[PDB]
Amino acid sequence: DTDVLRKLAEQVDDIVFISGTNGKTTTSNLIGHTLKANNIQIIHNNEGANMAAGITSAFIMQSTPKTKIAVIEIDEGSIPRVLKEVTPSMMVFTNFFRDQMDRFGEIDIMVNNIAETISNKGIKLLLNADDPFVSRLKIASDTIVYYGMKAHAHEFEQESRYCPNCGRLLQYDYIHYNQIGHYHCQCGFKREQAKYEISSFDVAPFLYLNINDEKYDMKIAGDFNAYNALAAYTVLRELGLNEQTIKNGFETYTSDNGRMQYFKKERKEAMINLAKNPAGMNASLSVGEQLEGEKVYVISLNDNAADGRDTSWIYDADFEKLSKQQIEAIIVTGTRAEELQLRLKLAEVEVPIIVERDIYKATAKTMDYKGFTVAIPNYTSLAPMLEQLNRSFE
Amino acid sequence: MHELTIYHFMSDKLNLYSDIGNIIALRQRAKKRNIKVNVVEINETEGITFDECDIFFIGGGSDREQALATKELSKIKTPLKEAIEDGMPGLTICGGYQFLGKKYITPDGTELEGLGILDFYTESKTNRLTGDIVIESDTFGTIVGFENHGGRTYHDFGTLGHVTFGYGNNDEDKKEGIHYKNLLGTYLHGPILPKNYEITDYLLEKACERKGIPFEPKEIDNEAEIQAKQVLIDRANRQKKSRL
Ligand SMILES: Nc1ncnc2c1ncn2[C@@H]1O[C@H](COP(=O)(O)OP(=O)(O)NP(=O)(O)O)[C@@H](O)[C@H]1O
Ligand SMILES: [Mg+2]
Ligand SMILES: [Zn+2]
């Protein structure tokens, strides 16, 4: 079966591996989504099964005569095992973050083992120039492509680092976050110039990227996802895709867990974002400020065991700020919809409140409005609300 | 417009029960009677005086924060008790209510000193009294809330009412909280005040007449409050019918 993978992979022209400690899945999804949005048959372990068996399984179940590109997310610790049977043409690495519970220098050791494993195989390596420990993999191929982010592209929501070439303390001209930044040892190991670079971006509420003098209007959020998008951008370009083809798929990709998850049908738009505590609610209530036009809210408050039976925390949330927004109506739902109605009355939020305790009906009701749906469930409300939203958007 | 002043004691340490919601309920009910409410947060008692106070409020903290709050409040035990004895309106929540009494006994038998304002005690047990609670009061109407406390409080004063669903102060009495003069105390969460507007209006009204300012209009719109109460009333009944 390890010979069957070897046999299956041989008939695939382009095999792209995605690895690193964080962001592999988002990166890999952006790549597979964008190719699929262009009618390119691909093998894609789109479920995150990034170990040898799951990679083997994807190849078995998805390979066809028309499958030109394999897009494979790989657990970094499985790189040696998979390389015995598959050699990729291209490999992108996102980052290498040492966790605080990791033992002494388990990172550089991991990166050496990876560099030794992939060494001298003609693999085109796509490296995060801003991560010193990804950039250390430059020693492992003669075909290196850098991506990175211009200094001051974004103000990220922020221990000490040692050079991976010579081991001396690293000097940084600028820090994006943690170890990600513009560094330069005295040994010569430095932050190299990037072939593809983000000059600036913002999150208002979704990523809006500026890559090599082109603008990408995303439908996912999260600071850190600019890097995953840029990594996916770099794969797609190196596969020969053009700005427009890449832009088409980047503009439609969305998350699927109910966290800043976007929806669209014709001109009607919605966004759903889980909030189950004062800080999560405040952030979900803020999203509407950054959306243009009238908004229609559906907010769900269940009080099941997993939610907690005490709903008093909604008084610690800043529902009063909704008065600064342009809102057609707020539908309150869940087993404790009436606490939400009463909370909003005391918030002096003077828009129509519709009490509809059935989460399904309350959520579908937002389709009756033309404004941007902002949908906010607490924990046990999420699955029914998300399911209705997928129903309503076809 | 008229003003009323709330002394909010130890708002920093005694912060476990979403006190702000009780503050909001008082601000909003008074605002519909054209009364502006100023809240004075009092976390240090040094020569504090009740001359300028219309209603006081003491929230609940953890066992450790309660004892430290009690130690700080004991610096004005006599100005406080004489204010209560003069009819000063007050609301106290969980620990802020329990430490009005003589002592609080933790589950392991540990004995914490209260203010001793009133002659009662509380003794905690590990198995908690938890759930929806529906109370029928002759002063506050139907009081509706959530309870979740290990403390069993034992006093021979008047209470917020009779418990038709839930426990109240302890396992046996089917009576909730304390009502002494204009001082209220309770174990209820929600917080208590937003749904239970007769309690909010009682305190505002007592402070209005003692100050000599009017409380008009007296009857206002309560639909949202009553709809929120009714959820718990209906569910309590269901739990009763489903226990046959
Ligand atoms: N570029 C990034 N930099 C730092 N953190 C990130 C980045 N991308 C994602 N993360 C965080 O990492 C978490 C996991 O993201 P994901 O895309 O699932 O990474 P992954 O590498 O696939 N994880 P795993 O398969 O468990 O090794 C996310 O919830 C983010 O909080
Ligand atoms: Mg993954
Ligand atoms: Zn160096």
Author numbering:
A (entry chain B): 36 to 193, 198 to 433
B (entry chain A): 1 to 244
Please, what does the article write about this entry?
To obtain insight into interactions of the GatD/MurT complex with ATP, we prepared a ternary complex by soaking crystals with 2.1 mM of AMPPNP, an ATP analog. The structure of this complex was solved at 2.14 Å resolution using molecular replacement, and the corresponding electron density allowed us to unambiguously model AMPPNP into a binding site in the middle domain of MurT. The binding site contains the consensus sequence GTNGKT19, with residues K59 stabilizing the β and γ phosphate groups of AMPPNP and T60 coordinating a magnesium ion that is also contacted by the side chain of the conserved MurT-E108 residue. The magnesium ion helps in positioning the AMPPNP β and γ phosphates from the opposite side. The ATP molecule required for catalysis, replaced here by the non-hydrolyzable analog β,γ-imidoadenosine 5′-triphosphate (AMPPNP), is bound at the base of helix αm1 with the adenine moiety bound in a cleft formed next to helix αm1 while the phosphates are contacted by residues from strands βm1 and βm3. The observed binding mode is in excellent agreement with our mutagenesis data, as single or double mutants of nucleotide-binding site residues (T60A, E108A and N267Y) have completely lost their enzymatic activity. Complex formation with an ATP analog revealed a nucleotide-binding site in MurT that is similar to those found in other Mur ligases.
